[PDB]
Amino acid sequence: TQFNPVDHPHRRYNPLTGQWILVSPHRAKRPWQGAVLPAHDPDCFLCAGNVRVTGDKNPDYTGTYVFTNDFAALMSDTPDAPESHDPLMRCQSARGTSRVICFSPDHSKTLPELSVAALTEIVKTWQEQTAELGKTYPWVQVFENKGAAMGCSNPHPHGQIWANSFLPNEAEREDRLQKEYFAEQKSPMLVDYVQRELADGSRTVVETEHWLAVVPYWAAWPFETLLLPKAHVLRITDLTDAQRSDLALALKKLTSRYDNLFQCSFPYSMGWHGAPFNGEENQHWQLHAHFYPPLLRSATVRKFMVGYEMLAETQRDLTAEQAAERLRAVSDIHFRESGV
Amino acid sequence: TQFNPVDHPHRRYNPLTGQWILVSPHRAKVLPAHDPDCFLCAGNVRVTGDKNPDYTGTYVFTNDFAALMSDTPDAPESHDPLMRCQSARGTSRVICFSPDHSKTLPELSVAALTEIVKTWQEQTAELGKTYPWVQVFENKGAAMGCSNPHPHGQIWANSFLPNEAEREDRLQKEYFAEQKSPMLVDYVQRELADGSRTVVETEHWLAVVPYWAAWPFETLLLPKAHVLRITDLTDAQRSDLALALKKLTSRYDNLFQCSFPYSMGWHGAPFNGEENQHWQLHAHFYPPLLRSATVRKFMVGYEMLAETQRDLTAEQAAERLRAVSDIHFRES
Ligand SMILES: [Fe+3]
Ligand SMILES: [Fe+3]
Ligand SMILES: [Zn+2]
Ligand SMILES: [Zn+2]
Numbered sequence: 133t134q135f136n137p138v139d140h141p142h143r144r145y146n147p148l149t150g151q152w153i154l155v156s157p158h159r160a161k162r163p164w165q166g167a168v169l170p171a172h173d174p175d176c177f178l179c180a181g182n183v184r185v186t187g188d189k190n191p192d193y194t195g196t197y198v199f200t201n202d203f204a205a206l207m208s209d210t211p212d213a214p215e216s217h218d219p220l221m222r223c224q225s226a227r228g229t230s231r232v233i234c235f236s237p238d239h240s241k242t243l244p245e246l247s248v249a250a251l252t253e254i255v256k257t258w259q260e261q262t263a264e265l266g267k268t269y270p271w272v273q274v275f276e277n278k279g280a281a282m283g284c285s286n287p288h289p290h291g292q293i294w295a296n297s298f299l300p301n302e303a304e305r306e307d308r309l310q311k312e313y314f315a316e317q318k319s320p321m322l323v324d325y326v327q328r329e330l331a332d333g334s335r336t337v338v339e340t341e342h343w344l345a346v347v348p349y350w351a352a353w354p355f356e357t358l359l360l361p362k363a364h365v366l367r368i369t370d371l372t373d374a375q376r377s378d379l380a381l382a383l384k385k386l387t388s389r390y391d392n393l394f395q396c397s398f399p400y401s402m403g404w405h406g407a408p409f410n411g412e413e414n415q416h417w418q419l420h421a422h423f424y425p426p427l428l429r430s431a432t433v434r435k436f437m438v439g440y441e442m443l444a445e446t447q448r449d450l451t452a453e454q455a456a457e458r459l460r461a462v463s464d465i466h467f468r469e470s471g472v
Numbered sequence: 473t474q475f476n477p478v479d480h481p482h483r484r485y486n487p488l489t490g491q492w493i494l495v496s497p498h499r500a501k502v503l504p505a506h507d508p509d510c511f512l513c514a515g516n517v518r519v520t521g522d523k524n525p526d527y528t529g530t531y532v533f534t535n536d537f538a539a540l541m542s543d544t545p546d547a548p549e550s551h552d553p554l555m556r557c558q559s560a561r562g563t564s565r566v567i568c569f570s571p572d573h574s575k576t577l578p579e580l581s582v583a584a585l586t587e588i589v590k591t592w593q594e595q596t597a598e599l600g601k602t603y604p605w606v607q608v609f610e611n612k613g614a615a616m617g618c619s620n621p622h623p624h625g626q627i628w629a630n631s632f633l634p635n636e637a638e639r640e641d642r643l644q645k646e647y648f649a650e651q652k653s654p655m656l657v658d659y660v661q662r663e664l665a666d667g668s669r670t671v672v673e674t675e676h677w678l679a680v681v682p683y684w685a686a687w688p689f690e691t692l693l694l695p696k697a698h699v700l701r702i703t704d705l706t707d708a709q710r711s712d713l714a715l716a717l718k719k720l721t722s723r724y725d726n727l728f729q730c731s732f733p734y735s736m737g738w739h740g741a742p743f744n745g746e747e748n749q750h751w752q753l754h755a756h757f758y759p760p761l762l763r764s765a766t767v768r769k770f771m772v773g774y775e776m777l778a779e780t781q782r783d784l785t786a787e788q789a790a791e792r793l794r795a796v797s798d799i800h801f802r803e804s
Contacts, residue, residue, distance in 0.1 A: 134545060141561075207481070211475040219650070219651070220662060222484070223484045226495075277772050321554065349554075401777070438617060439616070439626065440626070443609050443735070444605075
């Protein structure tokens with residue numbers, strides 16, 4: 133029999149991590165089975181004008197608001213751990229900080245539900261923070277964890293930003309791998325990849341003037357996406373004001389497609405990867421954002437990345453292509469905003 | 473101040489994966505024996521209409537929806553640096569632990585557990601004749617997405633070395649090359665002499681919350697002596713691993729007095745025909761609970777985008793595992 137990945141199992145390589153993903157397409161050929169918050173909450177610790185758990189009061193903010201995590205997992209003055217070469221048990225130093233970013237004072241409006249202007253303000257804030265912390269730390273990680281399924285206790289819409297005095301696992305790896313690719317190809321790995329997907333279209337989910345979001349060829353989560361700018365850009369702080377407002381639009385369309393997929397607020401973990409502030413030639417980088425969502429079949433049926441996946445290799449049944457196709461099928465205007 | 477990993481955040485290295493773990497210590501200061509409809513119960517028909525025998529001991533059957541098959545055609549060769557795929561064959565089986573639909577591992581007698589070890593050895597020997605990697609595992613608990621409560625494990629064989637295997641293989645090999653002794657053998661002897669991370673210890677086995685553990689109460693179970701695959705255990709090591717397992721899983725359930733979920737699996741030398749003296753058999757247990765029967769750890773956000781992070785240290789986790797009894801609470 134002749135090989136046809138739409139029918140036959142195989143593994144796909146993720147050039148950003150150097151790992152493979154096992155795909156079992158015959159397992160996803162079964163048809164598909166069927167199937168209100170206040171703008172302000174009195175007890176919400178993230179709400180404007182409320183006191184946090186430590187007693188501090190948030191300001192009467194009108195847009196975004198950033199504050200130092202009251203239980204920061206890292207600090208800036210941590211002493212250095214001693215050096216060691218123990219090939220079995222050894223530790224290194226860890227300094228950094230963590231901040232929380234409320235997207236807007238409206239306790240009930242998630243990203244796909246915010247105006248493009250509000251979202252543009254969010255991008256701004258991400259830039260300012262990345263720009264400020266990068267003055268001191270080489271890796272600044274902006275991210276968001278949304279939804280109870282992702283463990284989020286508090287539903288007020290917000291993200292987080294952690295700064296590290298070191299390049300965390302994912303960052304050093306993508307840094308390294310992108311660098312080799314560039315040393316080898318003379319062009320940035322993700323800039324080229326964008327070209328290829330723009331040309332193909334099978335995994336494309338949102339395309340705007342300056343951005344493209346696709347379910348990557350090597351996606352691990354069912355509806356995982358990769359949002360990248362179409363031009364070479366190293367960090368979020370390097371976007372032009374036009375790419376910036378367009379990113380706002382791209383985000384709104386992407387997350388609206390996610391919510392419309394199951395017509396529910398779509399949980400996920402997302403974040404941005406950009407060049408580290410380590411003072412090196414960072415040409416090889418291409419800024420991008422990953423969105424890793426757990427839902428698989430409905431609002432209640434998700435994917436569990438356990439067992440075989442933890443002990444051996446990530447595996448998926450639904451193809452990245454079928455995923456993208458289901459995502460293209462829905463509208464890119466949030467259901468709550470269209471009323472349909 | 474003087475650095476003090478007992479109070480100060482730091483990162484610990486995992487030599488088996490070559491990755492770091494960020495630790496922030498400052499932040500941690502009824503079922504019947506048989507079901508008439510159970511697809512895994514003896515004598516019942518499975519979803520496809522096929523019927524299980526009135527089995528005794530373990531029962532192993534080919535997954536009715538296997539994710540891999542033995543004759544999938546090959547993928548075309550390619551060296552594309554951006555979009556490339558590879559072939560994939562194997563098969564998957566399900567291993568019912570015992571005909572008792574309500575008895576989880578910690579609740580089985582040691583004889584019973586010895587029989588599971590035997591099945592694991594047999595399945596591994598058999599599939600290894602055809603596939604280089606055999607992965608025995610167990611996903612237990614609704615929290616791990618397990619639908620059928622009947623106690624059971626799974627075994628998937630693969631025609632290639634999956635990610636974790638390829639990596640452990642390579643790192644153990646490089647270490648063995650550098651040190652002339654297997655990484656995990658030295659590791660075990662090292663912990664056996666410390667005690668700091670020990671959670672279970674028997675004549676032939678040791679279970680510790682590894683130094684680089686990622687999950688809160690994650691453990692690494694392994695033999696004190698050098699053993700390449702599960703098929704290599706002597707019968708004594710074998711009966712001893714049954715006991716070590718009962719003890720470890722019993723402690724896990726006692727921690728919060730509930731049936732503790734987790735995903736666990738065995739890593740041993742691949743059947744690839746090369747010298748694998750660098751290997752050392754071992755099992756990993758990655759449990760999600762963190763503070764109670766209903767409070768778990770979510771591995772997300774920063775962890776998915778940057779790096780694993782934990783507040784409770786491995787030393788604290790092990791101390792908590794040692795503080796309870798190793799006899800299951802229902803058996804107690
Ligand atoms: Fe990335
Ligand atoms: Fe391992
Ligand atoms: Zn709120
Ligand atoms: Zn049963």
